[PDB]
Amino acid sequence: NDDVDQSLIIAARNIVRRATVSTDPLASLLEMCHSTQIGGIRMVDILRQNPTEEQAVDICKAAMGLRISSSFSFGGFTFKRTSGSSVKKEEEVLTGNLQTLKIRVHEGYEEFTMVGRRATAILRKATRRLIQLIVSGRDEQSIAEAIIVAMVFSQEDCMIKAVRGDLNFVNRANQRLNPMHQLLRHFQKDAKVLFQNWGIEPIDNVMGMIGILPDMTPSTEMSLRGVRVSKMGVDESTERVVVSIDRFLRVRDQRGNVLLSPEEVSETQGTERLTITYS
């Protein structure tokens, strides 16, 4: 059965990528799902009963008109809100390279768990301010990824002003990602200026925790402001809700929040362990 989940993910990822460049990505996504078999199993029959949670899989489920998790994906991390509330407020911000961006500011205090494939974190934030990030993971790059996503997601001014180039990031249909993803891709390419301008702070030596400096060196006395690494590990309750999906394969809940998009589907591709026919 775990072979089925693994091959279902590879199939959904290939189908979502191909649909994104079609003249009707939604109509093409559906006809491909209905035309693909996994180990002799109709893909639609698996999609109707398999509970594997993965960005591409749920985009397919949304296109099939089925319920998916209420959590949203950003930077590959599943964001599950555990406390607080926010109202979105349009703001024009100025990047460090003197360009304007109209972002939807999450105005409110909120607490999230971020569940990545290789990292987990607890995030507390206010309006355009990160309050606390406790992150765990098994290598540096995995923890850096979580920190970057949280800094970008916080929408802090220091993060906007750490941009050092024009933002021209596009999807596979040759088209500009929304402003949040413009910032994310920029710092995923290089986060040195972000880290160096974020700020550090003295920390209290607490058991099982350690600070992390801008160069991603551990330290016992200082740490990136609000950030701590838990060597013990952060340990993660999914509600399946009705969603909409548009011609760009952007999935939204019934209050307009984008939960998923092709740009949130991993570029990774393993090798299917069961044969996949795209008949």
Partner: nanobody, 117 residues
């Protein structure tokens, strides 16, 4: 003075096998998770596997699952990585580390594994 010293790396052909060893000294090996972390040419250090204190639970990155086995000898204080069906993309320096999460408490120096025809 914690000490970790890897050995057993070297040159092998695709599909071959290697047995990496890591000699630990200067701490009570028995009371710590141990891990392997690798760095391919031109890339960053990437977690490979972890093993709990008595070796009854193992953890693997999905790229090595079914091909590598992590193991430990708590009497001799040695960690091992038994590599079967090696691929070109397994080429990397392989580091023995103390602990289960980043930042690991201590790192070995690494031994070079080169899988090439």
């Amino acid at each position: 003075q914690v000490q970790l010293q890897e050995s057993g790396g070297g040159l092998v052909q695709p599909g071959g096998s290697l047995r990496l060893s890591c000699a630990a000294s200067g701490f009570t090996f028995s009371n710590y998770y141990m891990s392997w972390v690798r760095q391919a040419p031109g890339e960053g250090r990437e977690w490979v596997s972890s093993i709990n204190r008595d070796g009854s639970n193992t953890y693997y990155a999905d790229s090595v699952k079914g091909r590598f086995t992590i193991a430990r000898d708590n009497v001799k204080n040695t960690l091992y990585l038994l590599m079967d069906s090696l691929k070109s993309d397994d080429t990397a320096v392989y580091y023995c580390t103390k602990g289960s999460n980043w930042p690991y408490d201590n790192w070995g120096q690494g031994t070079q594994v080169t899988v090439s025809s």
